[PDB]
Amino acid sequence: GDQRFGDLVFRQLAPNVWQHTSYLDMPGFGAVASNGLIVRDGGRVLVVDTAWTDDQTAQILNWIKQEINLPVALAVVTHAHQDKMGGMDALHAAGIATYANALSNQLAPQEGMVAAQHSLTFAANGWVEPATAPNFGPLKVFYPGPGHTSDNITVGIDGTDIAFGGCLIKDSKAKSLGNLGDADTEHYAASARAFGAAFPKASMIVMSHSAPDSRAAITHTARMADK
Ligand SMILES: C[C@H](CS)C(=O)N1CCCCC[C@@H]1C(=O)O
Ligand SMILES: [Zn+2]
Ligand SMILES: [Zn+2]
């Protein structure tokens, strides 16, 4: 299943969907995996999240060229931390249009990230304002509320059973939500449940720091945020 391509790993999840995985030695935590997505929509490719670094992100684009060989129309990144936004400059160097929550772009400089070119804004109910996500094809973008960070967003893939929780969701047997340094501890639990309710038919939950899991990942995350 897994395909090793340099120091990255790619796994097909559905006919038009792949998970990209990249690793960063975080002193004190080991070599930490981070997952994002690659989606083919007809004659173009859409990317969810960068890798940790520009070099790794360029390797994602090289893998796309080899395995899909269609242009990358856009990328959307799911919050202003390095695992999701660390490779922005590589996307820009490649000419790819980039999108993030407006709040992620606001936070990017202080978090050490390069901002995306375009800002997404969200309705009161959490769904992206459609004019801010033009030409997103099957990507359905949802702001569940503050949790892992104030800016975290999530993405469903229409035509599949897949929803991507990014760093908000941990798998059903995880033991910790992380260090919570940037987390909204008051609202985290509600935000996790809101993600599940926004994508109620998704049976494959993809997330940044666990392999894909069933919907049990959402309720386990939500219970731990209760603490
Ligand atoms: C870099 C990354 C951005 S989500 C990060 O800070 N993490 C996630 C990796 C391992 C856990 C530590 C910390 C956390 O979530 O507590
Ligand atoms: Zn994060
Ligand atoms: Zn993360």
UniProtKB/Swiss-Prot annotation:
It is found in: Periplasm. GO terms for cellular component: periplasmic space. The keyword DNA-binding does not apply. Its cofactor is Zn(2+). It catalyses: a beta-lactam + H2O = a substituted beta-amino acid. Zn(2+) 1 binds at H79, H81, H148. Confers resistance to the different beta-lactams antibiotics (penicillin, cephalosporin and carbapenem) via the hydrolysis of the beta-lactam ring. Does not confer resistance to the polymixin colistin or the fluoroquinolone ciprofloxacin. Enterobacteriaceae carrying this gene (identified by PCR) have been isolated in Sweden, India, Pakistan, Bangladesh, England, Scotland, Northern Ireland, Australia and the USA. The organisms they were identified in were K.pneumoniae, Enterobacter cloacae, E.coli, Proteus spp, Citrobacter freundii, Morganella morganii, Providencia spp and Klebsille oxytoca. In India most isolates were from community-acquired infections rather than hospital-acquired infections, indicating the gene is widespread in the environment. Belongs to the metallo-beta-lactamase superfamily. Class-B beta-lactamase family. This is Metallo-beta-lactamase type 2. The gene is blaNDM-1. The chain holds residues 42 to 268 of 270 of the full protein.
